[PDB]
């Protein structure tokens, strides 16, 4: 139309871009703590 949308995809880019923030943030956080934990595994097993 566009609209793009009908709130609910513009305002569910409040979902979609922010579900992309839950996803990109999820990879961010798991990336962080996983990276530092494995860093504390070469610390914790090797070192």
């Amino acid at each position: 139309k566009n609209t793009t949308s009908s709130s609910n995809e513009n305002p569910i880019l409040r979902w979609m871009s922010i579900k992309m923030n839950g996803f990109q943030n999820e990879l961010n956080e798991l990336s962080g703590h996983m990276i530092s934990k494995i860093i504390h595994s070469q610390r914790l097993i090797l070192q």
Binding site: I39, Q42, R43, L46, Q47
Partner: protein
Amino acid sequence: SQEPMLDADRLRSSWTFSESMDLNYSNPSSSPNSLGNLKILLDDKASK
């Protein structure tokens, strides 16, 4: 240097704190290479 486990001596460790008593030596820390090393370090510390 070997601590190793004691209990010895006096307050059953009496030191037991023990952040290298003061360090982490927290280089930046930011330096995870670890070199696969070594002896630990003869280094004349063995000669010490």
